[PDB]
């Protein structure tokens, strides 16, 4: 029977994944500094590597985590903030060093996960369980992007691409999950994004799509309140 069985330093692909699962499974606001430091010790292995392969994987798994557990996206985002800030500057990649290296990693890992894409309109079932997760992890990502963007770990170009994707999927009878995601994103990044390398004029088109979806679309009262609130938050209150 194919079953499950229990049981200065370097680590192979498996040992890295296994240790990172455990560490990302333990990550809490209480045990943050202790666990984020051990995760940093795994990312610093790349000092003894040519193409910084281990560090790349650490960034990868963190994204995978943040996309399956949106409730902690902000916390996982800070873990990235620490890795960038406290990485060993002596780390070289044969493809920029120190922080500037991790920033590029974060951006690349975004593009990668983002290009995978997803669909909004979802058809129990078979492949349905997969296409539903793809959307969940997709929206989980757009959330994680927001928390990275707030900490200045990502550039505006990635935030634009993010809103870009949401807007296209926001004029084709948007699901409530999508609308939910856009509101939360706007509450996280809205004000800051207002000024960034043609930015506020992007929110103009976005909020316009919302005004339409508020005055025509058949959406639950709960969602309609969320849309109306952020509309007032930006236009009237001005994020204050």
């Amino acid at each position: 029977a194919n079953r499950w069985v229990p049981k200065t330093e370097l680590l192979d692909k498996d040992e890295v994944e296994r240790k990172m699962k455990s560490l990302l499974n333990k990550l809490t606001l209480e045990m943050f500094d202790a666990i984020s430091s051990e995760i940093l010790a795994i990312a610093n292995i790349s000092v003894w590597e040519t193409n910084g392969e281990t560090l790349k994987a650490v960034i990868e798994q963190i994204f995978l985590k943040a996309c399956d557990e949106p409730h902690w996206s902000s916390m996982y985002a800070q873990l990235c903030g620490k890795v960038v800030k406290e990485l060993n500057p002596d780390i070289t990649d044969e493809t920029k060093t120190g922080p500037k290296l991790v920033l590029h990693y974060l951006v690349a890992r975004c593009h990668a996960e983002f290009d995978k894409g997803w669909t909004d309109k979802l058809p129990m079932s078979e492949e349905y369980y997969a296409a539903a997760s793809a959307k969940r992890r997709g929206l989980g990502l757009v959330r994680f992007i927001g928390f990275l963007y707030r900490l200045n770990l990502l550039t505006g170009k990635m935030m634009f691409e993010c809103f870009r994707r949401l807007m296209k999927d926001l004029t084709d009878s948007p699901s409530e999950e999508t609308l939910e995601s856009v509101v939360e994103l706007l509450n996280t990044v809205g004000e800051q994004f207002e000024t960034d390398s043609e930015g506020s004029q992007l929110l103009d088109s976005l909020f316009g799509i919302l005004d339409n979806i508020i005055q025509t679309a058949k959406i639950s009262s709960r969602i309609k309140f969320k849309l109306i609130d952020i509309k007032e938050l930006r236009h009237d209150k001005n994020w204050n």
Partner: protein
């Protein structure tokens, strides 16, 4: 056990014709869809009917009468229009919190009774509320709705006379809403005497099953290896939050400190803890503070099985009956069985007539 006699179910708050400010309050509080009770009891209350609801705690009782009350409140009148009664001040304060929350967007003052003649909603215990009426402290002439929460508890706490008095001190046309987990002789007497053709509603607790969860096991062989398998299990699969069960308090606390040494963040609950304490522990846990909850078997009854994806029976329940209360209902259950726990897992095998396959290596996906 009373019989239901009102067949009108409203599934969405949107179909309850509530006021925006109130509707904003309920949403902006967490409620997204009406619970069993709320689907059947809210509307009749708003419509002016007397409502006798037999309901357990944690079904949405407080939300039911609170939403209906606020809807009926006249923001113009600056006097008590609804009285809410509870056995204890703790429970009274909770009711007030919820009422105030739902009324965050509305202009409605809620006062507790354990300057209350200008409040539009009064919450208190029978003894205190009575004394205040007698002392002409709070105006009762504008009262149109009288809500008795947990009537069985109020009567068992020697509040009969007080309650009876209150009934006679309110406007004879005051609408009466009574909720109670049990309907003993005492409570039914109040029902018959003080209530008019009541909408009788009964919400039965939902039966638990195993059909919703996929259950496995792991032959740890010896007790000394249980912890080993646990930590290794966190190397194999990704977990959001998990609930671990043990038979004794001692092991619950021992496992707890061990996990903390390995930088886990764990919450622990057992019997000797005051209900107050457990409640907080579970609230903070369900909010994401901790990612592991170790509990004894005794409190597998009054425990909440939320969207926690994973449940681990570190120990095997001495009482076969307690297996359902541990993993009953979409989730995953993994049991730790030793060489001597084999015959024990066999008991659970036949008792529930279910199947517990051995933990595969393909869990990262599952």
């Amino acid at each position: 056990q009373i019989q239901t006699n009102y067949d009108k179910v409203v599934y969405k708050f949107d179909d309850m014709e509530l006021d925006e400010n109130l509707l904003r309050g309920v949403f902006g509080y967490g409620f997204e869809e009406p619970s069993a009770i709320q689907q059947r009891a809210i509307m009749p209350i708003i419509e002016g009917h007397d409502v006798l609801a037999q309901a357990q705690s944690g079904t949405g009782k407080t939300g039911t009468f609170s939403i209906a009350a606020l809807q009926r409140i006249d923001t113009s009148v600056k006097a008590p229009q609804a009285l809410m009664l509870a056995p204890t001040r703790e429970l009274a304060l909770q009711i007030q919190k919820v009422v105030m929350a739902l009324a965050f967007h509305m202009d409605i003052k809620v006062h507790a009774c354990i300057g209350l003649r200008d409040a539009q909603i009064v919450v208190g215990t029978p003894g205190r509320v009575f004394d205040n009426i007698q002392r002409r402290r709070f105006r009762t002439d504008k009262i149109k709705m009288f809500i008795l929460d947990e009537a069985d508890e109020m009567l068992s706490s020697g509040f009969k006379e007080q309650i009876y008095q209150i009934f006679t001190l309110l406007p004879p046309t005051t609408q009466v809403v009574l909720l109670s987990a049990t309907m003993p002789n005492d409570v039914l007497e109040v029902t018959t005497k003080f209530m008019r053709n009541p909408v009788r509603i009964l919400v039965k607790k939902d039966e638990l099953t195993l059909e919703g969860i996929k259950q496995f096991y792991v032959n740890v062989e010896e007790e000394e290896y249980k912890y080993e398998c646990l930590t290794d299990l966190y190397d194999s699969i990704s977990v959001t939050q998990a609930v671990i069960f043990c038979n004794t308090r001692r092991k619950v606390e021992e496992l707890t400190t061990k996990l903390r040494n390995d930088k886990f963040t764990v919450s622990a609950i057992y019997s000797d803890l005051p209900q107050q304490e457990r409640d907080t522990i579970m609230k903070e846990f369900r909010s994401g503070s901790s990612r592991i909850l170790i509990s004894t078997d005794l409190l597998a009854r009054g425990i909440d099985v939320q969207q926690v994806s994973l449940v681990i029976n570190y120990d095997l329940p001495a009482n076969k009956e307690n297996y359902i209360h541990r993993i009953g209902r979409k989730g995953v259950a993994i049991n730790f069985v030793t060489n001597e726990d084999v015959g024990a897992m066999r008991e659970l095998e036949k008792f529930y007539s279910t199947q517990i396959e051995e933990l595969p290596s393909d869990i990262a996906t599952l």
